[PDB]
């Protein structure tokens, strides 16, 4: 059996195992990533969001994005580019702008053209629209929805196809794994893009899960079979699927019991990908717990990744690798 996650995915007939990355002076994560049998895809954690790429109108900021893209290209790794149209952390000039339908679209077009154009032939996937849905499956309120309406989603995909047809155009979102109204919303989005005669290549399930009930998420990672049916249901529309931001949080501190329970949760969701032909790959949201978004965003929650604060493999790493390698 293969001894690293990427090699295991390849041996099993999948495309990649990836991770989110922030380039920093601490070499702990990158030294693990350097192993070509371990990781084969990178998602820049922050360097390619709208604020990072165009913080002021017409003034692009390529340095960090170039640096993170180079981390993947210099190693011959795939790159998930993240993300174009997203409500969160929009620059003030976009979020608080005085827009009409036509002028906001011109702004979208200019941004999409410049960023997709620069990294064309490097971005394996693009998260074209991110987190466009409320928890009840209705459209999340943002400047894009207010000014352009529902049509902003297909228009974004039309602009993305024009700027770089060689990439895979993804819709990305969290909490789609549970087979509910939000899952249905993602399907509505995919249907809508296809209705315009446009291309949607994939649906990204972020997979920010829990292994036990937490204050922010009461429902722990569902059964392997349930997750497989959700994945296939999305694949039915004629798209690839992928787990894009996988982490599985618990109430801290961890104990051996909680670590094993967490490992079981990883086996279920990783297994669900193994079960579905159109599930192309898995990206975890970082290598080490040391730099995870979780404890800062939701204090009292954490221990969500495959390596601990000391860059040592947790029980979840072994359960993940074994699950990929199974039969
Ligand atoms: C802002 O302007 C855009 C055009 O620049 C408007 O987008 C248009 O929206 C309508 C729906 O309101 C789209 O119609 C749909 O077409 C598909 C298939 O072609 C069909 O399945 C639907 O039943 C519906 O008829 C239309 O295609 C779209 N036009 C373009 C060029 O994309 C948008 O409505 C404007 N927003 C506001 C708030 O006024």
Method used to solve the structure: X-ray
DSSP state of 237: T
Closest CA to ligand 1's atom 37: 148
Residue that has been written with the tokens 């077009």 in this structure: 109
Under 8 Å between Cβ of 100 and 143: no
* Cα 68 to Cα 62: distance, rounded to the nearest angstrom: 10
Under 8 Å between Cβ of 263 and 318: yes
* Cα 8 to Cα 151: distance, rounded to the nearest angstrom: 40
DSSP state of 257: H
Report the atom number in ligand 1 closest to the C-alpha of 158.
Answer: 32
Cα dihedral 148, 196, 43, 122 in deg (nearest 10): -110
The verdict on the CB of residue 196 being under 6 Å from ligand 1 is yes
At 247, give phi and psi (nearest 5°).
Answer: -155, 155
- Give the experimental resolution in Å: 1.9
Cα dihedral 290, 296, 300, 306 in deg (nearest 10): -30
CA distances from 165 to 76, 113, 224, 311 (A): 21, 12, 34, 38
Domain 1-327: homologous superfamily in CATH: Glycosidases (3.20.20.80)
For the chain, give every domain's residue range.
Answer: 1-327
Residues 6+ apart with CB under 8 A from 63: none
* Cα 64 to Cα 69: distance, rounded to the nearest angstrom: 9
Cα-Cα end-to-end distance for the chain: 10
The verdict on the CB of residue 151 being under 6 Å from ligand 1 is yes
Which of 151, 153, 196, 197 has most ligand 1 atoms within 8 Å of CB, for mutation?
A: 151
Q: Which of 38, 45, 78, 245 is catalytic?
A: 245
Q: Which of 131, 135, 150, 184 is catalytic?
A: 131
> Is residue 101 helix, strand or coil?
helix
* Cα 19 to Cα 324: distance, rounded to the nearest angstrom: 16
In the reported structure, the alpha carbon of residue 105 is separated from the centroid of ligand 1 by a whole-number distance in angstroms of 13
Residue 326 has which token pair? 């199974």
């Amino acid at each position: 059996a293969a001894s690293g996650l990427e090699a295991a995915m390849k041996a099993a007939g999948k495309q990649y195992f990836g991770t989110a990355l922030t380039v920093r002076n601490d070499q702990g994560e990158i030294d693990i990533i350097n192993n070509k049998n371990e990781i084969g895809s990178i998602t820049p954690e922050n360097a390619m969001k709208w604020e990072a790429i165009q913080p002021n109108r017409g003034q692009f900021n390529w340095g960090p994005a170039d640096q993170h893209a180079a981390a993947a290209t210099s190693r011959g790794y795939e790159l998930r580019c993240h993300t174009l149209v997203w409500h969160s952390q929009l620059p003030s000039w976009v979020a608080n702008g005085n827009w009409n339908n036509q002028t906001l679209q011109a702004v979208m077009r200019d941004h999409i053209n410049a960023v997709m154009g620069r990294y064309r032939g490097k971005c394996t996937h693009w998260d074209v629209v991110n987190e466009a849905l409320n928890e009840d499956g209705t459209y999340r309120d943002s400047v894009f929805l207010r000014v352009i309406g529902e049509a902003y989603i297909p228009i974004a995909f039309r602009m993305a196809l024009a700027a770089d047809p060689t990439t895979k155009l993804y819709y990305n979102d969290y909490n789609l794994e549970y087979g509910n109204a939000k899952t249905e919303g993602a399907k509505r989005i995919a249907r809508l893009v296809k209705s315009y005669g446009l291309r949607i290549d994939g649906i990204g399930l972020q997979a920010h899960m829990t292994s036990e009930s937490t204050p922010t998420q009461n429902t722990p990672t569902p059964s392997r079979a349930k997750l497989a049916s959700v994945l296939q249901g999305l694949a039915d529309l004629g798209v690839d699927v992928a787990y894009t931001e996988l982490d599985i949080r618990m109430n801290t501190p961890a104990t051996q019991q909680k670590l094993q329970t967490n490992a079981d949760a990883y086996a279920r969701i990783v297994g669900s990908c193994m079960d579905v032909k159109r599930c192309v790959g898995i990206t975890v949201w970082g290598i080490s717990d040391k730099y995870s978004w979780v404890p800062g965003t939701f204090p009292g929650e954490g221990s969500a990744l495959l390596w601990n604060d000391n860059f040592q493999k947790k029980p979840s790493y072994t359960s993940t690798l074994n699950t990929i390698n199974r039969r």
